[PDB]
């Protein structure tokens, strides 16, 4: 178990919201299999 390095530095109001506004709890992008972000240049096995 290792400490997380938050990018807010010295937190003096609220660290939970600080870790939200840190990149750790960021919203994450999913690569669609088909649809909008659909095109794959090369396959997983090709």
């Amino acid at each position: 178990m290792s400490r997380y390095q938050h990018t807010k530095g010295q937190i003096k109001d609220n660290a939970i919201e600080a870790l939200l506004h840190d990149p750790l709890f960021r919203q994450r992008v999913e690569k669609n299999k088909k649809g909008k972000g659909s095109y794959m240049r090369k396959g997983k096995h090709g």
Partner: protein, 173 residues
């Protein structure tokens, strides 16, 4: 408001992990968003008590009549001087208001320092703030701290968290 509200709701301090097919995205790509619930009790704003004559050190000196008043709070060690007025009583009254202002300022700084220390500890625990995980794509609710799971996402998001809060409160997390 109500009795035992902070005790009932104190396990909710932390982060919720939404995984769902986002409607706001044009392609229907699913999104993994986060939110925090932070609960803190309504502490009593105590009155700021006045300072004691023995706790103060009162000196008078010549202004640059010795109407200049230097009030020194001894147990903490903070001084305020005032020399602008011919009245030593006016100088002393302004010095006493300066005393009260600095005492209030120092109490606020002490409170903010204690809050910053608590934040240092809870930023140290860090990733442990991610307490709850709702996978609406696969329709499962998970408390990682107690590790408990359920499938009734509509009931959970309706507000039937009694089982989860009881599990967390018996866990002591």
């Amino acid at each position: 408001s109500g009795d035992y509200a902070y005790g009932w709701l104190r396990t909710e301090t932390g982060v919720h992990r939404l995984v769902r097919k986002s409607p706001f995205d044009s392609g229907g790509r699913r999104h993994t968003s986060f939110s925090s619930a932070f609960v803190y009790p309504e502490v009593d704003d105590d009155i700021d008590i006045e300072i004691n004559p023995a706790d103060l050190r009162i000196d008078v000196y010549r202004t640059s009549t010795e109407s200049a008043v230097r009030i020194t709070h001894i147990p903490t060690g903070i001084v305020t001087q005032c020399q602008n007025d011919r009245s030593q009583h006016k100088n002393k009254d302004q010095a006493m208001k300066q005393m009260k202002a600095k005492l209030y300022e120092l109490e606020m700084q002490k409170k903010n320092a204690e809050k910053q220390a608590m934040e240092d500890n809870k930023s140290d625990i860090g990733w442990g703030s991610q307490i709850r995980s709702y996978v609406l794509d696969d329709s499962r609710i998970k408390d990682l701290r107690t590790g408990v799971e359920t499938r009734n996402t509509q009931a959970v998001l309706d507000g039937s968290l009694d089982q989860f809060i009881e599990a967390s409160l018996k866990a002591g997390l």
